[PDB]
């Protein structure tokens, strides 16, 4: 069984993507989440910013060096979400979390890979279009994540290279289909089945 999933994070509700990720992780899957700046948080953005400011307010008064750490990246904020959907203090949950790697955008390590989606966690499936929503990168670019624009530019250059290679590959799927429909190919094929 191929138990390695590469999830594209755009258009996904965050906690709804995280449940299906964490349930796979505890079953031995290795999940990588790309485009984590585009993972969606439903509701209007000001409610989502107040939830983040409530998160930023919680710190150890005695020693904030050991307090609740506050993550400004969308990748580490989404990792923090799935971290408590597993039993991470136990060894079974911490081992599952080692099989997550969450990235913003598409790094060039993941060029020409085969990306997955969780359709039960998609925003267009779960949410109503009347309702508001906002992504991680929309939130966290106003909380100290300075890399939204460089992520999207390097996201585009990956998608243009992959669209180029898909334009070449499906033409090869076109010509192989046109070859395999040809009567020259067929009578070549029935000649081999005649000899067997």
């Amino acid at each position: 069984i191929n138990k390695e999933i590469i999830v594209d994070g755009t258009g996904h509700i965050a906690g709804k993507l995280g449940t299906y990720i964490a349930k796979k992780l505890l079953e031995g899957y290795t999940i990588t989440v790309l485009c984590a700046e585009s993972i969606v948080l439903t509701g209007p953005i000001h409610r989502t910013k107040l939830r983040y400011k409530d998160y930023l307010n919680k710190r150890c008064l005695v020693n904030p060096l050991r307090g609740p750490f506050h993550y400004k990246e969308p990748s580490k904020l989404f990792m923090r979400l799935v971290k408590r959907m597993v039993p991470y203090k136990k060894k079974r949950g911490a081992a599952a979390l080692q099989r997550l790697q969450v990235f913003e955008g598409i790094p060039e390590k993941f060029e020409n890979t085969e990306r997955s989606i969780c359709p039960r966690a998609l925003l267009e499936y779960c949410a109503n279009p009347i309702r508001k929503s906002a992504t991680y990168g929309k939130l966290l670019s106003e909380f100290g994540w300075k890399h939204l624009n460089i992520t999207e530019e390097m996201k585009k250059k990956v998608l243009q290279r992959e669209e180029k290679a898909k334009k070449e590959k499906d033409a090869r799927m076109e010509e192989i289909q046109r070859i395999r429909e040809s009567s020259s190919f067929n009578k070549e094929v029935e000649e081999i089945m005649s000899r067997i």
């Binding site: 069984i1 079953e27 031995g28 079974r92």
Partner: protein
């Protein structure tokens, strides 16, 4: 002989348990491609083997799929020796023949 040649791989996902109390004699397996309860009825009574290595020496722990579990095709299996919780997330191989509760 590969196990995946004749047997369908199933991931050992949990023991049969409550919220806290765990009954380790029955192991819950998720067979690949089996997603509903009636689909898993095809695998009731089927033998199952868990293959492992002890000091580099191959061992076969054989079992039987005993009952269904839930609405999502999870089945409960009882083996000769109970599955360790270390092997949660690893695969066990579901045979295509039925075995009996006495004779694995």
């Amino acid at each position: 002989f590969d196990p995946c040649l004749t047997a369908i791989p199933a991931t050992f996902i949990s023991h049969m348990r409550g919220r806290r109390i765990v009954h380790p004699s029955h192991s819950l397996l998720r067979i690949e491609g089996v997603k509903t309860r009636e689909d898993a009825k095809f695998f009731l009574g089927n033998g199952v083997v868990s293959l492992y290595e002890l000091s580099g020496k191959k061992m076969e722990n054989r079992g039987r799929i005993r009952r269904l579990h839930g609405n999502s095709g999870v089945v409960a299996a009882k083996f000769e020796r109970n599955l360790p919780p270390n092997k949660i997330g690893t695969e066990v191989f579901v045979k295509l023949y039925k075995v009996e509760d006495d004779d694995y």
